[PDB]
Amino acid sequence: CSRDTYALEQSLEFVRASLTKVDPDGSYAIQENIPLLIAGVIGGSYSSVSIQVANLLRLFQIPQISYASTSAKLSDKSRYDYFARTVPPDFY
Amino acid sequence: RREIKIEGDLVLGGLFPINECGRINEDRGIQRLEAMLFAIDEINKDDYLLPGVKLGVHILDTCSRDTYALEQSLEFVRASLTKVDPDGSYAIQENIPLLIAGVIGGSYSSVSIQVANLLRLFQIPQISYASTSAKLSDKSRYDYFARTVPPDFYQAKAMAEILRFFNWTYVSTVASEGDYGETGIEAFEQEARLRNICIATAEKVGRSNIRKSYDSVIRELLQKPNARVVVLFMRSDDSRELIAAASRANASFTWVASDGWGAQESIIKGSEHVAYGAITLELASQPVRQFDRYFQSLNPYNNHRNPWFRDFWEQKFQCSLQNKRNHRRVCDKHLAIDSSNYEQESKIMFVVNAVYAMAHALHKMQRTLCPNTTKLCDAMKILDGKKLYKDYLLKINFTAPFNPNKDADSIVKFDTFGDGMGRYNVFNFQNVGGKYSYLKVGHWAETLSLDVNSIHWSRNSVPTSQCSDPCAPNEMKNMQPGDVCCWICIPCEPYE
Ligand SMILES: *[C@@H]1O[C@H](CO)[C@@H](O[C@@H]2O[C@H](CO)[C@@H](O)[C@H](O)[C@H]2NC(C)=O)[C@H](O)[C@H]1NC(C)=O
């Protein structure tokens, strides 16, 4: 939705798969809809969305590749050590 | 995977370095854990603040590592996603994690940084009790992290002033890798450059558990006999490792230590011969007598909440229990920790202050967001992290919980950077009556207040942490022949 908070919520939905495995006891059995373990995240349009999702995925060592985030704030690998892109940075 | 859980409407997270992870951190970690537990019990026992709502606990061991602390914070945060996630046959109960109102913990800078980066995604306020690093001062990267302790540049400039007071121009320094040691040593180097103090060697260590690097660092320190003062800036584990390495060799440096070492009994207890005039500095604080009497009465069969308490007793008293009955002796029934057994940690009151700050923020939110009642309501069912933090934590101002003096310092105030007052107590590891023990020798709030007559230097002489000569520029000059910073005298002709 071109917003940082909504993208953060969607990345939370993405990442709610590794914690499910370590978490599920109950009567009989529970199936519901088990989230799949995301091998890597492809997305991150707009710089705010990419920054938020990279900050989220740096906690779960989930690689992220962006297609349109051409901001220079994501160039450094210290804050975002699992974020990459196929587009040039912003100073160019 | 040992966890401490107490049922309650609002639960406060707990991050402590209980295990230093196979060995238990006796003085720091478990004492801080007990301080938090005692503060929460006092909060639940008095009706003046938070009368109706009960404050649960969620305490986890960080093992003094960033990855383990990250995993424990993941365990903490796996409560909001559970509610939005659970269909299944019949019903599923298991063990529903409780929604953490706020996280109280974050010893060591790396743990605090990782947990703050985790909680910034869930608007969960975090209050630290021992992370005195300057990297967390900014509110941009960490917009939900605060602390009851001053930042690191105050400590760095205090160390620089201590060096300058004794004219220790030529010093050697060893720093720890990561977020605390690196930033703190950068600030200290900047302060030394401002005050014209030349560092002989800048060494960095790591938590690789390899003594070879530590003894190599000790040998490198020995390579500069002129710099007999070591400004040691590292964590407790790294300080202990370097103390052991220097004890393996023959070193007699006067370690000007930081809050990482401070007034710690385990580091010196490893070996007391290497350290005899170490001018350490820790966060200035007053011991809590209520927590003293709470911890003195603690017994292995009395406090069943802590899964580590039995192992704490076994490690501290060296006596095993009936589980083994062959490795060691049997602990006495009259055995206790009443007196002459433990020394109060200087950051216990900081833990109490952090817990009471979180409690007072919750109480103010209840008095504002949930009026006409002192118990839980619909408004308090869901907590707004941004509002709670920004309003009732960054603008909080309350007196100290247990301080009959009620002096000016008995006020917990969060500045614009979410930090505490810059007060430091400078101790020296001197001997007064044949028994080694720390005792306060100075103070630093805005300027040094030091007692030279009660220092008792190593080798019973004032250290000379200077190069060959400061030289006289009136009739000579300097050329820096061998050292980048040190120099020598070359006489100047009358016509030059
Ligand atoms: C540290 O260096 C300063 C600068 O020399 C010393 O200050 C003066 O030292 C001379 C003797 O060297 C005294 O006659 C002066 O009275 C001192 N003036 C002041 C304002 O201190 C200082 O004594 C030195 N301190 C130590 C512990 O060596």
From Swiss-Prot, chain B:
An annotated GO cellular component: postsynaptic density
Glycosylated residues (UniProt): 167, 250, 372, 397
Tissue localization of expression: Detected in brain cortex, thalamus, subthalamic nucleus, substantia nigra, hypothalamus, hippocampus, corpus callosum, caudate nucleus and amygdala.
GO biological process, one term: cellular response to stress
Positions on the Extracellular side per record topology: 1-496
Domain of life of the native organism: Eukaryota
Disulphide-bonded residues: 21-63, 198-485, 319-331, 370-377, 467-486, 471-489
Residues that hold L-glutamate according to the record: 109, 130-132, 180, 259, 347
UniProt membrane topology term: Multi-pass membrane protein
Chief location: membrane
UniProt entry keywords in alphabetical sequence: Cell membrane, Disulfide bond, G-protein coupled receptor, Glycoprotein, Membrane, Receptor, Signal, Transducer, Transmembrane, Transmembrane helix
Subcellular location: Cell membrane
GO molecular function: calcium channel regulator activity; G protein-coupled receptor activity; glutamate receptor activity; group II metabotropic glutamate receptor activity; scaffold protein binding
Quaternary structure note: Interacts with TAMALIN.
Task performed by this protein: G-protein coupled receptor for glutamate. Ligand binding causes a conformation change that triggers signaling via guanine nucleotide-binding proteins (G proteins) and modulates the activity of down-stream effectors. Signaling inhibits adenylate cyclase activity.
Family: Belongs to the G-protein coupled receptor 3 family.
Protein name, UniProt field: Metabotropic glutamate receptor 3
Gene: GRM3
Part of the intact protein present: 30 to 538 of 879
